[PDB]
From TrEMBL, chain B:
Native organism: Kutzneria albida DSM 43870
Keyword Oxidoreductase: yes
Domain 6-phosphogluconate dehydrogenase NADP-binding residue range list: 5-148
GO molecular function: NADP binding; oxidoreductase activity
Name the record gives this protein: Dehydrogenase
Length: 286, 287
């Protein structure tokens, strides 16, 4: 159980440190303000006096701060101190910011793995917790068991920026699945059906929805959209009806109105018998 | 079991309904404007009526599945008299209002009326995980439960005949969303030469996680207590914004993220930064 350093003891940094201690790793920490380490120190962490001391304590440095501007302000000065060590950046940001950091890290002989956490702090340590990871194969490989302490590490390849990009893509799905659940909850609420009554029907249906995705994917990749069954035409009509029925029943229309718009835009450019997969082309053109 | 059944409408869906009744040894009487479509069914043992009225009179329970409720109206209205005292099961697709009118009309003519919405393709009828939302007469539901389970897992939602359509539309909303956002994600990753099928298994696992968040969200939507220490509106709205910008930077459109960003921010505007995502139901209701 090798010594690890954590920089940044916000809610997520504190949980990374805590999971290291619960696996018996000597855990050295730093934060710009010291009182935030107090609980971790009671639990056997060592609060370093400066960032630089903290880095010199461990072969692996985990950084987790608000954003990549804060991360650059903190890491830039530590360049020579980090050289020869492994750096894992679980700060959240864009593909570009991770790509920048990876560039900088390579200048200085810093083995750089960028990760994006898909989970809350209470989630650090649970196998349900996915960490997307991208960058140094060596760091991923060498410190796998270390990373697996925070959750299931999905190593996506060498482009530092892929974890952010996958994370944002997936969050897309979540945001949109949740918005539409609450849309339907509101709609059924106009007949005094509650969200908790609706939920199991939604959970069942989601099983069907996931079963549709392999075929949609296949057509998205091939470019051959033609279907005989779930025509874009009829789906566009569906969305219009969902929108109108939502209004009739007494709620807003934003969720169905926006989908109608995008689906109808493809219908206006594509074919009546286009599959839903054809939306990918409209989405690209934007 | 094995009562007489009539099916009006032998389109893709109507045939597969009659098919299943028949398969399971129901005396099945069918009618369809175009008689030729009754071919195989008559061959596998179904009785083609000469008129729809003849078909109605042949059975205590009548199943109707045609293009829409306008055609169903023009087809059923003239049959009000011969329908009296029978069970009508309407599996035509339509709006809640259309179902409600149908159930009104049915009541004012002594017809027991269950309305239904099939959440499956014809080749799914009789298969596992086909789901039929049902609403209207419980008695019809009760008396014909075995008949109905031949088609799929019947889900009786209550007395109001509009419910099956209303739930259906609410569920389709989820489908249309999850699909769009799946393709948005596939588009985005396509810019780094990741295929939709490489993306797929990530999405399949993650969907399971999203599914696991919905119980908590549903509870807050119903309680009105939106507070969270973990994923508040503020960081979600920021994330949405970031997904938009990154989408643009990587070289695709922003339709899906941009629309989501706006909707979630609307609540933020009105509410608190530490509101959970459940809070969004409030925005959608007051719209
Ligand atoms: N929390 C969540 O639900 C999720 C979080 N994430 C990401 O995880 C990362 C960590 O977030 P978290 O640590 O919990 O956030 P907090 O704001 O709670 O902590 C951020 C850390 O940055 C430090 N910091 C240094 N300079 C600054 C500055 N100028 N302004 C603000 N903070 C500064 C803070 O020190 P100090 O103690 O002195 O403030 C603190 O250590 C983020 O990049 C976040 O977006 C990802 C998924 C979900
Ligand atoms: N198929 C599917 O995947 C799904 C279907 N549904 C719903 O099931 C219902 C039936 O669709 P489906 O069977 O696929 O459609 P088809 O177009 O294959 O069949 C339409 C049926 O309606 C009849 N019809 C149309 N116009 C008239 C008219 N003026 N007078 C009398 N009969 C008429 C047709 O008679 P004729 O043969 O003489 O034209 C035929 O029996 C629809 O409400 C559909 O939306 C629900 C979910 C999915
Ligand atoms: Na060293």
């Amino acid at each position: 159980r090798e010594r690890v350093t954590v920089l940044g003891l916000g809610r997520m940094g504190a949980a990374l440190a805590g999971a290291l201690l619960a696996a018996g790793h000597p855990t050295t920490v730093w934060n710009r303000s010291a009182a935030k380490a107090g609980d971790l120190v009671a639990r056997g962490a060592v609060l370093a006096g400066t960032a630089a001391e903290a880095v010199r304590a461990s072969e692996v440095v985990v950084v987790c701060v608000t954003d990549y501007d804060v991360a650059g302000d903190l890491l830039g000065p530590l360049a020579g101190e980090l050289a020869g060590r492994a750096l894992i950046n679980l700060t959240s940001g864009s593909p570009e910011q991770a790509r920048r950091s990876a560039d900088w890290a390579a200048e200085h002989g810093i083995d750089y793995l960028d990760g994006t956490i898909m989970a809350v702090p209470q989630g650090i340590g649970q196998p349900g917790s996915v960490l997307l990871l991208s960058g140094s194969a060596e760091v991923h490989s060498g410190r796998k068991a270390l990373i697996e302490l925070w959750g299931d590490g999905d190593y996506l390849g060498a482009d530092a920026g892929l974890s952010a990009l996958y994370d944002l893509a997936l969050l897309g799905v979540m945001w949109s699945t949740i918005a539409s659940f609450l849309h339907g909850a509101a709609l059924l609420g106009t007949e005094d059906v509650t969200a908790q009554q609706f939920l199991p029907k939604v959970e069942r249906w989601l099983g069907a929805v996931a079963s549709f995705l392999p075929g949609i994917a296949a057509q998205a990749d091939s470019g051959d959209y033609a279907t005989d069954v779930s025509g874009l035409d009829i789906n566009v009509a569906g969305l219009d009806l969902l929108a109108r029925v939502s209004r009739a029943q007494g709620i807003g229309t934003d969720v169905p109105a926006a989908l109608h718009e995008l689906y109808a835009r493809r219908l206006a450019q594509g074919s009546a018998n286009d599959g839903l997969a054809s939306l990918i082309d409209t989405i690209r053109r934007g």
